[PDB]
Amino acid sequence: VESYRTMPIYPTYNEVHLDERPFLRPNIISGKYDSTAIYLDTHFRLLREDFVRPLREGILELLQSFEDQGLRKRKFDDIRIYFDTRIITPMCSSSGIVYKVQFDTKPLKFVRWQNSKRLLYGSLVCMSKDNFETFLFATVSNREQEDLCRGIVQLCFNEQSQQLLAEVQPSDSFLMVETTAYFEAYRHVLEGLQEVQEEDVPFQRNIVECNSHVKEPRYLLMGGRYDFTPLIENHPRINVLDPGQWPSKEALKLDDSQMEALQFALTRELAIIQGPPGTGKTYVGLKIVQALLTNESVWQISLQKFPILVVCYTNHALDQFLEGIYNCQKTSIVRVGGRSNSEILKQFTLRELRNKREFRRNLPMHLRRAYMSAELRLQEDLHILKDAQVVGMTTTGAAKYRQILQKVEPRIVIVEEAAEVLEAHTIATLSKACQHLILIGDHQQLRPSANVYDLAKNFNLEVSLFERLVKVNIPFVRLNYQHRMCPEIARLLTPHIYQDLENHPSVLKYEKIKGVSSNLFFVEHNFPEQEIQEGKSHQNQHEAHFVVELCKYFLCQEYLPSQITILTTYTGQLFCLRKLMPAKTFAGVRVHVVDKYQGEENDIILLSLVRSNQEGKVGFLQISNRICVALSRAKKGMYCIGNMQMLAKVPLWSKIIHTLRENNQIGPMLRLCCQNHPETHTLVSKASDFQKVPEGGCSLPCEFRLGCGHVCTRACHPYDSSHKEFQCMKPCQKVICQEGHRCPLVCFQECQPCQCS
Ligand SMILES: [Zn+2]
Ligand SMILES: [Zn+2]
Ligand SMILES: [Zn+2]
Ligand SMILES: [Zn+2]
Ligand SMILES: [Zn+2]
C-alpha cells in the first residue's frame, strides 16, 4: 500500500489515459476515525483528487474533441488553451532555472491583462506536442503586464519535466493548458501535508479520537495568575481557573456572553466560539489577545520568546484584526504577505522590517560576513519574529512558510473565520508545539467551496474543521445578543434559523426609513426568468428595473450612496444590474453577489432573488446557510423581491413567508409615502410606476416661491427644501440698463451688460 506521501501530487499518465478510479473515503462526520494515519490519507486523497479531477476530465474532453475542428472557439470551463506555444530561451533566476515561453496573441486581443486571472504567478501549466502523450508540468514564475501583452511568460519547470527538457527543440510547438483553480492554495498545503508527520499533529485525542473531553492548556498546570488592568483601563493577579475571581464585564466593556466566551477561550486549550452575524467577534478577539499578551509570564516558560500566531483566510480580515489590536498594542506586530492594502500595517511588513539602517547595523557580524562572501534571506526572518508578540498570515501563507513556523514553534494559534477554512488547511498550520488553538467563526453561514460538486456532496469535503467538531459534539460556546439588525429583520432569523437570539437594546433605537410605510417589505411577482447562453447563471429584467428604480428613489431621500448597497444571488443578474447602472447617477453604490459579500454590512440592502419559473427549479437558494447569509446583511433597510409561490416548497422559505404574512410586510405592490404630503400613498410594482415620483416626492408641482420671485419648475422634491442649490430656468427679465431693456439671460444667471451698454 502506497503511503499518501509517496502519492505523486501531479496527475500521472495512468490517471488520465486509462480510467482508473483512485480509492477515496468520505469523511466520517458522524463518528471517530480508525487511525490518524488513515485520517491524513483520506484528507490528502480528497484534496488531491479535488484539484486533479477537473484537469484529468478536461484533458479527456480535449483528446476526445481533437477530431472536432472547432477547438479554438470552444470555451472549456475548467481549463484554458494557448495555441502555438514555443519554448524560446532559458534564464537564470534567484529561485533556479526559468524558461521564457511565448504563446500566440491573436485570439487573446480581448484579454485585458491588468485584471485577468490567467497565468498568474504560481499556476500549473501543462505542455505537450503529441496530443498529451507526454506532460511537462510547469509553474508560472514571473509575469509582467507589458510582457503578457506580447505573449511571453516565465516558467519554472519541475524536476521530472526538466529531464524531458533536455531534448526539446525551440521549433517545437506545445499546447498550453492551465487549470482555472488557483494552484498555490492547493500546492503549499499539499506539500506541507505530505511533510506532516503522524506524531506532530497535535490534539490527536480530540480531532481524530472524537472525545468530548477538552482539558485546560498544559501550561496552566504549572501555575499562572493574570492581571486584567490593561483591559479595564485601555489589579491583583487572578487565577483564571477560578470563575469567581474574574473582573467585571462593564470594566472590560463586554456583555455576559462575550465575557463567558473570553473566559472559556482563555481557560480551555481547544475552545470553539460560535457567533451569529453582527454579534461581534473581532472585539472578543482583541480582548483575548490583549489579556494573553499582558500576562506573558504565565505561558512563556523559557527565556526564548514564542509569539502569538494569528492566521486567517482573507487578507482584509487579517488587516482589520491587526488594526483592532493596534488600539491596545502599538509595537511588535509583524505581518507576512505583500497583498496588504492597509497603510497602518504597511510599516510592519516583512520587507520594511528588513529595511531601516539600524537593522543593517545591528545584524550579527557572522551573518554579515556571509552576505559579502536563499541563506541570507533566511535567518533574517527568524530574528525579527523572535522580537514580536503577534504574527499574521493567511492559511496559504502559513502552509508556504511551514518550516519557519516549525522553527519558531508558536504556542498560541488563532484562526479567525474558522468556518471558512478547509480542514486540510488547518492540518497544515498545526505544529507539534501547539498547546493552545482557538477557533472563531459561524458554521451556520457559508463554508469553503469545492471545485467539484460530487466530493462536496457525497464526500463532505465542504465540512470545515469548525463544523466537524461542532457535529461530533465537542463542547462549544454560543455568542448571544445581536447588535446589527433591527427587531423586524431579526424576527426572520428567529426561531427559523437560530432558536435563541436576543436583540441588544441599542437596536430598538433604529429610526424608520423615510418615504415608505414599511422598513421591511417583500415584493412578490411572477415574471419568468431569462436564461443566458453562457454560464449557468440567471437574471431577471423586471426585478433589475424595479430595484434600480427604488435605488434611484432612495437617493432622492438624502440617503448617501455609501449607506446603500445592492445584493443579488447570481452573477448574471449582477452583470444585468451594472447594465442598468450609469455611474453618473448612482456613483458609490456597490453591487456585489451574496457569496462575495460575506462579512460586509450596510445601512440598506436591496436583495433580488432572481429565480422565478414554473418548473420549480429553485437552484441553490434551497440551502439554509446561504439564506441565513443573504437575509441578515443590512442594519435598517430590507427591501426584497422574489417569487413566494415557488419558494414555499423549501420549508425554511415557507416559515419565512408565513412570518412575513403575519406582519403584512409582503405583497405584490410596495406602499410608498411622500414626505411633504404624508396623506398620499403611492403603490409601486413596476419600473414604469416610478414616473409618479420623479424627484421622490409627490406628483404635485413643487409650487415653492424661489427667492428670485419665480416658482420651482421641478415637481415635489424633499431634497434641498431651501432650494439654495436650485437654479431658476425661467427668464430673468430684470432691468439692467437705464433704457429699460430687460435682461435676456436666465434668471439664475448673473445679469450681463445690455447687448446699449
Ligand atoms: Zn409631495
Ligand atoms: Zn422646488
Ligand atoms: Zn438679468
Ligand atoms: Zn427666477
Ligand atoms: Zn440697454
**Cis amide linkage into residue 495, ω under 30° from 0:** yes
Neighbours of ion ligand 2 (CB under 5 A): 702, 704, 712, 714
Distance 749 CA to ligand 3 centre (A): 7
696 Cα to the center of ligand 4, angstroms? 23
d(CA 489, ligand 1 centre) in Å? 29
Using the mean position of ligand 1's atoms as its centre, give its distance from the Cα of residue 701 in Å.
8
Burial letters 488-522, b for 16+ CB under 10 A, else e: ebbbbbbebbbeebebeeebeebeebebbebbbbb
710 CA distance to ligand 2 centroid (A)? 10
C-alpha 712 – ligand 4 centre gap (Å): 8
- In CATH terms, are 214-478 and 487-691 the same topology? yes
Q: Is 392 exposed, middle or buried (0-12, 13-18, 19+ CB in 10 A)?
A: buried
Nearest residue to 123 via CA among 86, 97, 153: 153
Residue 636 Cα to ligand 3 middle (Å): 47
Q: How far is the CA of 737 from the centre of ligand 3 (A)?
A: 10
Q: Which ligand is nearest to the Cα of residue 754, counting in written order?
A: 5
| Distance in Å, CA 639 to ligand 2 centroid | 28
Measured between alpha carbons, how far is 684 from 523 in angstroms, rounded to an integer?
Answer: 10
Which amino acid would we find at residue 112? R
Span from the CA of 718 to the centroid of ligand 3 (angstroms): 29
- Ligand positioned closest to the Cα atom of 749: 3
Domain 487-691 sits in which CATH superfamily?
A: P-loop containing nucleotide triphosphate hydrolases (3.40.50.300)
Query: How many whole angstroms separate alpha carbon 161 and alpha carbon 13?
Result: 13
Which residues contact residue 92 at a Cβ distance below 8 angstroms, ignoring those fewer than 6 apart? Answer: 98
For ligand 4, the distance from its centroid to the CA atom of residue 697, given in whole angstroms, is 22
Query: Coil, helix or strand for 465?
Result: helix
Give CA–CA dist 526/642, Å, rounded.
8
- Residue 709: left (phi > 0), alpha (psi -120 to 50), or beta? left
- Ligand 3 centroid–CA 744 distance in Å is 6
CA distance 444 to 625: 5
Proximal ligand: closest to the CA of 678: 1
Breaks (C-N over 2.5 A) in the chain follow: 234, 373, 755
> Which strand (E) or helix (H) includes residue 458?
helix 453-458
Q: In what order do the strands lie in the sheet with 602-608?
A: 590-593, 564-568, 602-608, 634-641, 520-523, 666-667
DSSP string, 173-206: -EEEEEESS-HHHHHHHHHHHHH--TTTSS-HHH
Tell me which ligand sits closest to the C-alpha of residue 726: 2
Nearest to 637 by CA among 699, 709, 551, 571: 551
| Gap between the Cα atoms of 601 and 586, Å rounded | 19
Among candidate residues 484, 418, 506, 477, the one with its CA nearest the CA of residue 257: 477
Separation of CA 333 and ligand 1 centre (Å): 56
For the CA of 739, the nearest ligand: 5
**Ligand 2: centre distance to CA 708 (Å):** 13
Per-residue CA distances from 481 to 60, 254, 602, 753 (Å): 53, 11, 19, 69
**Minimum-distance ligand to the CA of 731?**
4
Give the count of beta carbons closer than 10 Å to the beta carbon of residue 485. 27
Distance 723 CA to ligand 2 centre (A): 6
Residue whose C-alpha cell reads 462575550 in the numeric block: 258
CA of 634 to the centre of ligand 1 (A): 28
d(CA 728, CA 743): 14
Report how far apart, in Å, the C-alpha atoms of 426 and of each of 32, 118, 182, 338, 469 are.
18, 28, 18, 22, 13
Rg of the chain in Å (alpha carbons): 31
Q: How far apart are CA 335 and CA 398, in angstroms?
A: 11
User: Which candidate, 286, 359, 313, 141, places its Cα nearest to that of 350?
Assistant: 359
Amino acid identity at 240 = V
Sign of the four-CA dihedral 468, 470, 475, 481: positive
Closest ligand, as measured to the CA of 704: 2
464 phi, psi to nearest 5 deg: -70, 165
Q: Which ligand is nearest to the CA of 707?
A: 4
| Cross-strand bridge partners of residue 564 | 604
Q: How far is the CA of 715 from the centre of ligand 1 (A)?
A: 8
Q: Where are the domains of the chain?
A: 79-179, 214-478, 487-691
Q: Which ligand is nearest to the CA of 753?
A: 5
Name the CATH code of domain 79-179 (choices 2.160.20.10, 2.20.25.90, 3.30.429.10, 2.40.30.270). Answer: 2.40.30.270
CA of 723 to the centre of ligand 1 (A): 15
The ligand whose atoms approach the alpha carbon of 728 most closely is 4
Nearby residues of 731 by Cβ (< 8 Å), 6 or more positions away: 743, 744, 745, 746, 747
Backbone phi, psi, residue 666, to 5°:
-135, 130
The helix or strand, by DSSP H or E, that contains position 408, with its residue range, turns out to be helix 402-408
- Rounded-to-integer distance, Cα 703 and Cα 714, Å: 8
Using the mean position of ligand 3's atoms as its centre, give its distance from the Cα of residue 717 in Å. Answer: 27
**Ligand in nearest proximity to the CA of 751:** 3
Which one of the ligands is nearest to 730 CA?
4
CA 467 to chain centre: 18
- Residue 720 CA, ligand 1 centroid: distance in Å: 13
The phi and psi torsions of 637 (rounded to 5 degrees) equal -130, 115
Which ligand lies nearest the alpha carbon of 708? 4
Distance of alpha carbon 442 from the chain centroid: 14
Q: Closest Cα to residue 470, out of 270, 668, 630?
A: 270
CA 733 – ligand 5 centroid, Å: 12
Q: Tell me, in angstroms, the distance from the centre of ligand 1 to residue 684's CA.
A: 16
Experimentally determined by: cryo-EM
Q: Which ligand is nearest to the CA of 737?
A: 5
Torsion angle of alpha carbons 556, 561, 567, 573, nearest 10°?
70
Measured in whole angstroms, the distance separating CA 593 from the mean position of its chain's CA atoms is 11
Ligand 4 centroid – CA 588 distance (Å):
33
* CA of 696 relative to ligand 1 center, distance in Å: 8
Q: Give the ligand with the smallest distance to the CA of 752.
A: 3
Domain 214-478 belongs to what topology?
Answer: Rossmann fold (3.40.50)
Q: How far is the CA of 698 from the centre of ligand 2 (A)?
A: 12
Place of cell 414616473: 691
CA distance 181 to 356: 39
CA of 732 to the centre of ligand 5 (A): 15
Distance 753 CA to ligand 3 centre (A): 9
CA 361 to each of CA 355, 364, 371: distance values in angstroms, whole numbers, following the listed order: 11, 9, 13
Taking the centre of ligand 3 as the mean of its atom positions, its distance from the CA of residue 715, in whole angstroms, is 25
Q: How many Å lie between the centroid of ligand 2 and the Cα of residue 564?
A: 25
In contact, 405 and 412? CB cutoff 8 Å: no
Instruction: Calculate the alpha carbon distances from 717 to 555, 675, 702, 703, 720 in Å.
Output: 12, 9, 7, 10, 8
- Listed residues: CB within 5 A of ion ligand 1: 674, 676-677, 697-698, 716
Distance 705 CA to ligand 3 centre (A): 18
Question: Measured in angstroms, how far is the CA atom of residue 739 from the centroid of ligand 5?
Answer: 5
